[PDB]
Amino acid sequence: LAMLSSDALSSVAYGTEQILIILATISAAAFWYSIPIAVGVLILLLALILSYRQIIYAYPQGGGAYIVSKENLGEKPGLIAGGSLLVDYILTVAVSISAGTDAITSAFPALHDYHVPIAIFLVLVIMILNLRGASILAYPVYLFVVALLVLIAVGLFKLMLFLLLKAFSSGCSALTGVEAISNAIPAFKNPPARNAARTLAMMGILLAILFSGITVLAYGYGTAPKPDETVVSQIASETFGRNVFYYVIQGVTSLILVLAANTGFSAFPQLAFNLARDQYMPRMFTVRGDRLGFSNGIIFLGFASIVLIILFGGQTEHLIPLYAVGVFIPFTLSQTGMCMKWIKQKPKGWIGKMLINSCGALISFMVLSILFVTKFNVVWPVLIFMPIVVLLFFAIKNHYTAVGEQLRIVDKEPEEIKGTVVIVPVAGVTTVVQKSIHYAKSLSDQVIAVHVSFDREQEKKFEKRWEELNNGVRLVTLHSSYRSLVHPFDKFLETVEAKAKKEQFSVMVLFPQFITKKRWHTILHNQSAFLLRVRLFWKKDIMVATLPYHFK
Amino acid sequence: LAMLSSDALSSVAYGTEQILIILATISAAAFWYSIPIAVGVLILLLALILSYRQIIYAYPQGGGAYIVSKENLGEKPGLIAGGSLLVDYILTVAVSISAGTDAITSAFPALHDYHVPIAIFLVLVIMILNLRGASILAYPVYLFVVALLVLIAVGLFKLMLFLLLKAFSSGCSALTGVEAISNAIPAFKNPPARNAARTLAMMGILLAILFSGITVLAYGYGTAPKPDETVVSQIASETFGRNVFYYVIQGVTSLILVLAANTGFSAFPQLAFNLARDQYMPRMFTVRGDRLGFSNGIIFLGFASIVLIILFGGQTEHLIPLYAVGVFIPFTLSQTGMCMKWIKQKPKGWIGKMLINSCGALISFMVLSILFVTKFNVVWPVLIFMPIVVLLFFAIKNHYTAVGEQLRIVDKEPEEIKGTVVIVPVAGVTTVVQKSIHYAKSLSDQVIAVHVSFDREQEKKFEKRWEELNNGVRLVTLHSSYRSLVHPFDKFLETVEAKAKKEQFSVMVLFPQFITKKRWHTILHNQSAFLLRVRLFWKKDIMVATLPYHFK
Numbered sequence A, B: 001l002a003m004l005s006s007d008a009l010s011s012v013a014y015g016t017e018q019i020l021i022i023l024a025t026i027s028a029a030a031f032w033y034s035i036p037i038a039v040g041v042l043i044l045l046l047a048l049i050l051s052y053r054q055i056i057y058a059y060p061q062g063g064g065a066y067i068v069s070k071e072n073l074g075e076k077p078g079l080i081a082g083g084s085l086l087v088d089y090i091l092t093v094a095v096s097i098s099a100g101t102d103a104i105t106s107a108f109p110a111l112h113d114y115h116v117p118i119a120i121f122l123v124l125v126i127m128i129l130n131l132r133g134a135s136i137l138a139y140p141v142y143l144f145v146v147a148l149l150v151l152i153a154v155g156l157f158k159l160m161l162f163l164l165l166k167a168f169s170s171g172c173s174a175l176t177g178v179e180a181i182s183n184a185i186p187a188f189k190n191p192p193a194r195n196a197a198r199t200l201a202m203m204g205i206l207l208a209i210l211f212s213g214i215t216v217l218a219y220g221y222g223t224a225p226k227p228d229e230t231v232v233s234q235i236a237s238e239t240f241g242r243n244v245f246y247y248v249i250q251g252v253t254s255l256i257l258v259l260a261a262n263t264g265f266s267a268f269p270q271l272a273f274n275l276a277r278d279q280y281m282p283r284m285f286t287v288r289g290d291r292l293g294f295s296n297g298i299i300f301l302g303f304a305s306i307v308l309i310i311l312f313g314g315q316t317e318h319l320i321p322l323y324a325v326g327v328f329i330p331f332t333l334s335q336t337g338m339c340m341k342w343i344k345q346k347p348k349g350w351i352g353k354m355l356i357n358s359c360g361a362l363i364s365f366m367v368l369s370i371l372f373v374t375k376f377n378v379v380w381p382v383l384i385f386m387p388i389v390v391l392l393f394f395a396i397k398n399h400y401t402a403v404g405e406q407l408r409i410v411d412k413e414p415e416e417i418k419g420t421v422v423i424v425p426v427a428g429v430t431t432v433v434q435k436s437i438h439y440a441k442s443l444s445d446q447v448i449a450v451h452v453s454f455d456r457e458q459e460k461k462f463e464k465r466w467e468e469l470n471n472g473v474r475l476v477t478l479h480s481s482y483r484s485l486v487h488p489f490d491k492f493l494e495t496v497e498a499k500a501k502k503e504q505f506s507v508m509v510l511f512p513q514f515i516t517k518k519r520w521h522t523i524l525h526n527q528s529a530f531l532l533r534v535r536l537f538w539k540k541d542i543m544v545a546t547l548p549y550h551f552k
């Protein structure tokens, strides 16, 4: 469960802190109310757990909060859930990294001045880790569970209305990672659905225990959220006095928050694939296992997290309502979808599932409404992003539908080709030119070599050296008055294409891609051919073949 | 002259300011010494002018300070001059933009807090202007000349030892733009050499007049360099009292400094071409007039100027010794090269050219030595960049020489090809697939279509739809258990390449590049083919042809 429960188990490092921050606007003595609200949050958690249990039972293939919110409501709610899951992933990496840096700064207060630099550094190291592709993502979660359990144990040993709703919303903001198991069902044992339901029940129990313990410890110690450190940090400090175990707790908390960010990065492509299978995201994302869109997606979430951690300054309190909205819109849409699927169907336990999902959906909608009407000064990014991202999804869907309409219809075959002319541009006669012209002669005749010379005498010397060469292909030296390569070439191209069309031939070009095993010679070599392809050979409907001449 | 004299004529906005800053460490009363040093700088200017006059006479083709410093000394000094000209261009854009922003902030003191933001904004707007490719670059220079001439006139109307060497160096740092005419000789009238010499003489006279007037006005007004504004700004303010004409002077000064930055950007590719013609810079830069390396070069100088304006904070005083070193190393190397060319040859006026170039070279070497031993805390970027850039130039030269050795030698022709097999991967039968397979059948037989299916039933449906299609090409459905596209494909590729080699055939692949006239659909369409080309078709020596299927 660890590799998937990272998000939810790490949420306790800031759930109680958010509750206390919202309850600190009244007075310190109001911290009493942090005890009921917490269990109230747990109540919602119950519903969510129960609700999502049904989802793993409902969709063994693994749908999370998108398939449920698309197959049940319709196109627009499904795309809204998808866009909100995307913003949930961006906020997951942002908030998890911000809280990890805040925990580190709590451990080492001298670093507190450099909060956003270490934050962007952590984002960048996670980006690099997820760009170059385990059991190293399961030890930190178990360490965090053990450390927090023993911290709760020793804390108990030592110990032995609108604003309330705002606190309830900001505390439910500690329930964000529950979607991970519903998204990653297909990664389980032989009974995937039952095993995933069991492990999500274990996740719910463990998260409830951790959150309740942290809240009761915060109540007992009478702690308050200092801008310098988290509430869990204060609990550990007041329980163990900044000893080795306190530093262990801080390091493990930071590690699990980094791990939660990593889970956000590694679970975004699951959303991208679920969307691109429905023609809403680019087809590059359809090949999930080959990691095609993985690099682009990691780049995008890394840059978005950087932007949302610099604009918001790394203060997790100012980013947590954005995260709560981004994770609770999919919650509401998913629970509403489960409710609608239940009412449309007639299963045996119809009434119980009805009531549970309806209660959960109402609670989640109430929470997100409060987040809207309370922290709008930090939730307006949702109101500017969801329209943009959903309109982008719909634009992609419209484009793919138009392409399908203009492509599925097979029509009359084109006119029969009676041969090809292969223009083989040459810089200087080398082994690469010899190989390319040999292959061109293999493909067809009329192998027209062309050299766009920049000097008349050099042109004559090159033509003489060509006449020395034994290849029997006609070569055309085009003189360019200034150091140009496109205009003479495209003039010759127009002439040769007109001649080929009159003789009914298909124009083809060879561009030997000189490849050297050094990974930085690509800027040096064959960078004058990408010019030709981009400029005058992808606008003419002309085949442009590349011969990978390797270097040794 | 304006489009080339922008740099030198804009240097007066900060030359006298630098002189006064260096002379302000003693006392305000030391500003008297700003009068002799200025004319002393003028003396050096004379030599430089004279020296570079000879260069336009020596090299009508246009060599500036690189060809002179390569054809006369040798490889290492020539590459040192090239690298130092590159750092001179980076510092030209950086310092010119920084001084322009400083002049703007002088005009509008409320903007002085946002100095580096407006600086990076100006760098970015010049980058955009020089990325998308006049007479709009000549009016600002003439306006600046007229404004400063009338300012000098009204200023005269109103008015009617180691540290000294440091001031002399920082004042000679106002002589930076002289290289522009020597670089852009070929852009002149029918007698290019004589006309360029005449216009550089006019440049020298005008720059001397402007600098002498500004220095004498600074002496007369007793002005001192305030961190808030330039010396020319103080002159204009004390002469015209922040009237409309003072704002005109400030705006025109900022405009000409922006224009100087633009000249740096637009003259860097001249250096890049002069280097790549000698195999020291990538061959992408050889095609100067077609603007191949222009985009990469503009990107590089823009980012380097951003780095050197953020690290140095936009303070032109802390960037001006870097600029002076970067412009005076090429000065010294060029004058030494002219001296050595004179001594090796035996021209009529041998002794005069000898003495002039020797005096200029000694003065320039002394200036750069003082810049080294005085402002090293801001000149260490040269000491970390010149080794890197010169070693990079030598690495490129070695790589190109090795490639020439391994390529110029034409060897025995490869074995004769007896035909080709064209693998034509297919996603779904469309018009694009029909066109690509028609072209493949045109090229050769054994048109092997392949479909890497992700679902068995979908595979059967696709095969049935193919059998419905009339094309007589064998199709292979490869089943991938997970959503992959490389591994099944490269296994099939290994098998088919082995079969082709046994039958002695050359493997070829077709990848129809779906092009839509929208400039942002490239992320959507045909992004699963770049995967194949990069992953398993540029490591196998397999021709990879792309068919530009346009969209309508």
Ligand SMILES: Nc1ncnc2c1ncn2[C@@H]1O[C@@H]2COP(=O)(O)O[C@H]3[C@@H](O)[C@H](n4cnc5c(N)ncnc54)O[C@@H]3COP(=O)(O)O[C@H]2[C@H]1O
Pocket (backbone or CB within 6 Å): A424, A425, A426, A427, A428, A430, A432, A433, A436, A450, A451, A452, A453, A485, A510, A511, A512, A514, A524, A525, A526, A527, A528, A529, B283, B284, B400, B403, B404, B407
């Ligand atoms: N003598 C030499 N010294 C060092 N490196 C050498 C070399 N001869 C070839 N190479 C390297 O091998 C690549 C093979 O270029 P090729 O001449 O086959 O094929 C050329 C030709 O098809 C076309 N092309 C480039 N310049 C051209 C020109 N001036 N006139 C006509 N076609 C040109 O672009 C292709 C690649 O051009 P690019 O020069 O970027 O790419 C060259 C260059 O990177």
Ligand SMILES: Nc1ncnc2c1ncn2[C@@H]1O[C@@H]2COP(=O)(O)O[C@H]3[C@@H](O)[C@H](n4cnc5c(N)ncnc54)O[C@@H]3COP(=O)(O)O[C@H]2[C@H]1O
Pocket (backbone or CB within 6 Å): A283, A284, A400, A403, A404, A407, B424, B425, B426, B427, B428, B430, B432, B433, B436, B450, B451, B452, B453, B485, B510, B511, B512, B514, B524, B525, B526, B527, B528, B529
């Ligand atoms: N039914 C449809 N709906 C919407 N857009 C459609 C479409 N059919 C084709 N296109 C668009 O046209 C491009 C032409 O792809 P084609 O199938 O010729 O050529 C394919 C094929 O040669 C290869 N390829 C991609 N997926 C493959 C797969 N699953 N199995 C085998 N080859 C594949 O890569 C080429 C380009 O793939 P990609 O899909 O990026 O590129 C596709 C896609 O962008």
